[PDB]
Amino acid sequence: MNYQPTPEDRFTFGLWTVGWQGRDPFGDATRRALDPVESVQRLAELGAHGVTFHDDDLIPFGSSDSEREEHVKRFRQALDDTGMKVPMATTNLFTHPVFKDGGFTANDRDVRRYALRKTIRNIDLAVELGAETYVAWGGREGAESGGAKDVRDALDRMKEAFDLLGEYVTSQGYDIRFAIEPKPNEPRGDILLPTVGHALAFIERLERPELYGVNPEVGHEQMAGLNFPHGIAQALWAGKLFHIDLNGQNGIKYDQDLRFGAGDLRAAFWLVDLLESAGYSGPRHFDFKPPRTEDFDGVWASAAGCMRNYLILKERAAAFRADPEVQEALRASRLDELARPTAADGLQALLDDRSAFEEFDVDAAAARGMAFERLDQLAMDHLLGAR
Amino acid sequence: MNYQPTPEDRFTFGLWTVGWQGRDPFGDATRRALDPVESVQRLAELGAHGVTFHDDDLIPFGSSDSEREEHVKRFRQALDDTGMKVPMATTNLFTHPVFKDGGFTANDRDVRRYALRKTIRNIDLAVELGAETYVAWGGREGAESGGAKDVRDALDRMKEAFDLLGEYVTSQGYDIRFAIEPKPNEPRGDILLPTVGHALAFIERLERPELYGVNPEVGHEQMAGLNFPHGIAQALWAGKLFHIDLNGQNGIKYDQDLRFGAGDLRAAFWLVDLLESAGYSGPRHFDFKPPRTEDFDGVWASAAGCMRNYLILKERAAAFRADPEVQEALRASRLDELARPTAADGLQALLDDRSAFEEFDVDAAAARGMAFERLDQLAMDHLLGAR
Amino acid sequence: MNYQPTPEDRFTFGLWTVGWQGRDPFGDATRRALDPVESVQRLAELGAHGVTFHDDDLIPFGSSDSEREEHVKRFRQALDDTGMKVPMATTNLFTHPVFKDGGFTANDRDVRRYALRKTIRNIDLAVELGAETYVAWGGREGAESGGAKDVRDALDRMKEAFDLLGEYVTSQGYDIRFAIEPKPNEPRGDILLPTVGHALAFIERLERPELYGVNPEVGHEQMAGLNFPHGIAQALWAGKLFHIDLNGQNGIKYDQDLRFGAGDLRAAFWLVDLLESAGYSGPRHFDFKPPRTEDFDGVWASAAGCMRNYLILKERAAAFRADPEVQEALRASRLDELARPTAADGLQALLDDRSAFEEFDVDAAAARGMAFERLDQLAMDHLLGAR
Amino acid sequence: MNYQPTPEDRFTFGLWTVGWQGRDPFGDATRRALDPVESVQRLAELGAHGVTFHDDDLIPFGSSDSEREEHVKRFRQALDDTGMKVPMATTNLFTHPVFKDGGFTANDRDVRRYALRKTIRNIDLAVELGAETYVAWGGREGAESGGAKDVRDALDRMKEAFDLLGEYVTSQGYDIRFAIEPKPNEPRGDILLPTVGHALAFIERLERPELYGVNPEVGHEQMAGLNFPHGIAQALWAGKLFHIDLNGQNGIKYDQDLRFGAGDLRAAFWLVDLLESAGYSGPRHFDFKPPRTEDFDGVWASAAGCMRNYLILKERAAAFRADPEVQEALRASRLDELARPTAADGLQALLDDRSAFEEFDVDAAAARGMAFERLDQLAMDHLLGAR
């Protein structure tokens, strides 16, 4: 009873994940830097389907056009040697000090123009390597104090930047869509577009809303104490689940980025149940950090655990949905009824229907138990293999 | 140096606020029930502009049409005697046991039809009494376990219900708009549309989005650790701030509903700064609960404190914005620059502008300090009257 | 592969758990009251070992001595008929309005004397029914505002009350110990002795510290975002784990009291691992509330799930500790070394040991990986039965 | 109406506070390193009384005995030139990779011995420079996973280390006491002794408890959602408030370390009220980080704000306690009664007192209002200078 990933499972990792050196707010790096070529080779051996990158992970900041081309050629040869793909790319608009007050919403206009230029340069590269999605995480957009940022002005600036990127992609005829990734705080005291809901609402005000979706991260919605699977169902309902970041988090605290399955395990089960039942077909991307207590062996074990945990949860959710006893429990809890329209008969029919009010027996309806605890215990039995 | 409210300040209170008997999950009521007529009279004496109600606060559940009319006539006479208005009304779809699994999203179809009928009956009453806004708080919509609610089906049901209410209002020619009020949890384990962002996004999928806005509550966004003034700026940016619920909360815990100004005082200051500077012209509604430790004297002192605290914050934010030293600090922090377009010159101009990339001096830009702490201390000096 | 509880498993429940009518801050009861005799009989049938009670759960507040004796005789006959025991008892010092500002720390001296009298009356009853532990949950001790309670004065009053109860027990020659149960908030804004640590520290200032221990609750330490199993290890380290309250909670929010195993499942696994490995021999008490969505069938299914979940976790933690591959992993992570004294050689020997400083190779030591992720994945494999 | 600090106010700062370069988990330093001599001079000019240090802030890790002496001589001359003192010192047992699994509780025994040696070397230096308090923050003691640390073994190791340090100090005849500083998480997933309560309880198990107290930090207890002033009153009640770390934090999130007065302003007011009324006479130490958005001018403005905010709160709490109207309100809320013994008459007298039970009028007592909201509004009026 083994669970082996194959490239067909669509598992992807950022270069910055297995490549994290372990530098935290309180400590120095515990591991040497990894050459991107080595990460591509090691991930291919574990069964991953591909990798993602920020511009700065692949081409060191400040590289001349000569070194740039060299870094790209070497990477490209590693992808050719292993069959690994690059489904998503993003920009680093958070490390360099110039971004201390943001990229797209920095108060300084000069920095905002620079941020757009750095981004556009990377979209060209992403298209060349075949990415289908371009993510945007505005980690420096926000503030630590109230007077430092007028948020209405900041959203105008954020809209302006995304509308210019949409103009660029359409002008070039590229087949690439954008995915905004929300985070409530860290590194800024409060970050703009803090949750999936805030990001979905913002997209509706862009000039071409169809080019943009969300890239939610498990641990970021949990940093606000929200239900991850409910946020994802809202993103699927809106047709905006363009990409996803998988990891684990233990509650409202700093962003841990533990391997997928760590953190809230029941949430991980319901998330896999939802992705598989809704037919999500994008990459299963892991944005995690092998703890700094680990050496290289531990990095590879942590990345392998990410894939393993998804495969086990996939099997348990499938057995759960397939069990006839569960199907009867879902009927007993009226899941079937939730799926039917409340009033396909229309407004006038509802208004004339005495069974909906005048003669509705509230006490009989109220006495009906929901049977949700029997259903939840079947789900627990299935996750634990005690079924 | 006194701060007296007058009806011109637009301060409103729910009957359920000063009328809360003090029953909590762990204890019996500490105060006798108040007759709505008495609350109208006492609030008019403190300087309030009006009151709001849930159908069940005014007409006891189960009342025959005869008692209904009687409860309304008496209320109407109290409004005439004091000059108090009724700017908002709402429905109780949470107390009666029939609503244990929700109103609009209950799994039982019969309950969902009943919920719509109970709501429609109250919209007619609200219009008769002159309300301009009808709020919807789906406190029972959500779940305690994963299998109990398919959220995509639940959002279809929630959309269906709001679309039918929109059809009803337009069919009757009423001048009333709806305001959805988000809450992340309590009484359900997780509530649907948990934050202002989730509610704004949902409204964009309704058949007539222009009839719906949000009614955010200070304490509810703080229950998710979010920045209230940032959520309100997003609601104003979208043109959807239809009404607001003012109160205080000390962090992520049960919903406290303390008087306005209690809880996060700095957030209260920035919220008042924003409402007044954006020109919000709706009611300043207090949805709070005088602590159960209080007698009737304490209820009235708590409600008076609500208004007083808003008036003091209003004065301090106005002195803050009016101070020439603050105006120079805002320029020093580049608030002026955040308000200017990043690229009014257009995409092609940005792409050809070498000053935005090729010749951008990142190090010089990065070395520029934001001066946000000097600005924040001026704001602190102003709030404390140490300026 | 079934998991049947027997009285030998020591599973206990409060009358107030399966007896919760479902009244919440926002809603009326959804279930009729249960006669204590019926709960005793139903729990005996599910395999429980016993029940616990607050004075007010067994004898309705205000009962004359005649009704009191009657309520006791009936209960006593049900215990005799089923073989159920009563290992713990407690006092209700939170429901009646008189307790609105606390019991032992109320500002009114008269209420504090009354609280002690009500408690003493119940200790006599508890001893008569054979309880070995008397719990104290000061749910009303605390405040919603800063000036309302001087905490140093409040701790003097709390010490005085516990010292008088200790004097009473010793004077009567009773074999009963006290267990203080911490809760950070709810129903008060902030409760005194908010966590296990605060309660252990307070006990050290009592006149006879040996008579007092703690009764930690899973969900209460999680309401402060703390690690439950770490708090329990500290209570075991101090020799103060007198009783325990088992349930589930999903994070920092209102006190949910879900059935045990719900909430943080990994925490539940590590807690069972610790109770069983440390040899905890007290009752396994469930302080939970079957959700108000349930009818009587759902109440009994929820209580049965509590016991089932403990039994499954017990089996998985035992298989985890018994696996030779886990034993080698623990050695690989140096768990063996953590158990050895750092300096049994003494201070002078450590000071003269050049291998501890002057010649310590920090870089070699730092490069050693902890292998914690391999170990954690083995634990995950074991919990899920994927091992 | 100015608030100027003087050395008599006892304001102190760590070298690491104004010296923070701005490196965060997501970004590079934004400011150049400061020479400790320059910080001493600048702080003396702002009115500080002294500075504190970790060994590594003063003498770069790895320095030979020759460079060590040089770093000390230069520092010593700056203290002589300005009249600044050094009231506290501490050890860095968290930055170097060797400490990745902790100092005193690392699984590797060799690292634990090294940690003690590094600490002892610094206690000698601290005594030489005149420190009266030696702080211990075990930031790396804890874990990210359950199996990685047996907590009972870890507490044995932590007790062993503190007992050896106590043996060393007494053996040398030094007049220095230890202060343990709690933090619930960050950098480890969960840190041992997470709150003031956990640290006070642990001290009671040391061989010489009188040598140890706590160094609580505002932002750390708030990271667990706890009430800072209540934790401090418990530490004062126990006679263990040896030192204090002042700063601001906005809720449960990463450790922000904002300047004092930022964060929870009402908590800051009640904390100052308590320190001043209890007569705390130790240093008023600021452990904060000027935001990375700032240049050197902003660093100095942030440090000056720390002192200013304490002085303003000190004035408002003193006016609050001195107001006759407040004194009458405290009597109205029975603060006077909370300070009197509940039963100085003794147990037997309480048991025979019918006024405490048999004839206690619970309904009359329950109807008495606490008048806490009037009292809290007076406190708000006083903090805002609207009084």
Ligand SMILES: O=C[C@H](O)[C@@H](O)[C@H](O)CO
């Ligand atoms: O920009 C980095 C990514 O876009 C993101 O997914 C980070 O790794 C933050 O979660």
Ligand SMILES: O=C[C@H](O)[C@@H](O)[C@H](O)CO
């Ligand atoms: O339905 C009640 C209201 O709509 C709401 O504002 C409540 O008082 C919850 O906050």
Ligand SMILES: O=C[C@H](O)[C@@H](O)[C@H](O)CO
């Ligand atoms: O007083 C009730 C109990 O002592 C306690 O365990 C409650 O059920 C709160 O958790």
Ligand SMILES: O=C[C@H](O)[C@@H](O)[C@H](O)CO
């Ligand atoms: O060890 C550093 C200190 O002891 C501490 O106060 C830190 O600055 C963490 O808060």
Ligand SMILES: [Mn+2]
């Ligand atoms: Mn993350």
Ligand SMILES: [Mn+2]
């Ligand atoms: Mn991410």
Ligand SMILES: [Mn+2]
């Ligand atoms: Mn509320």
Ligand SMILES: [Mn+2]
């Ligand atoms: Mn509200």
Ligand SMILES: [Mn+2]
């Ligand atoms: Mn509880």
Ligand SMILES: [Mn+2]
């Ligand atoms: Mn309990």
Ligand SMILES: [Mn+2]
């Ligand atoms: Mn800190």
Ligand SMILES: [Mn+2]
């Ligand atoms: Mn500190």
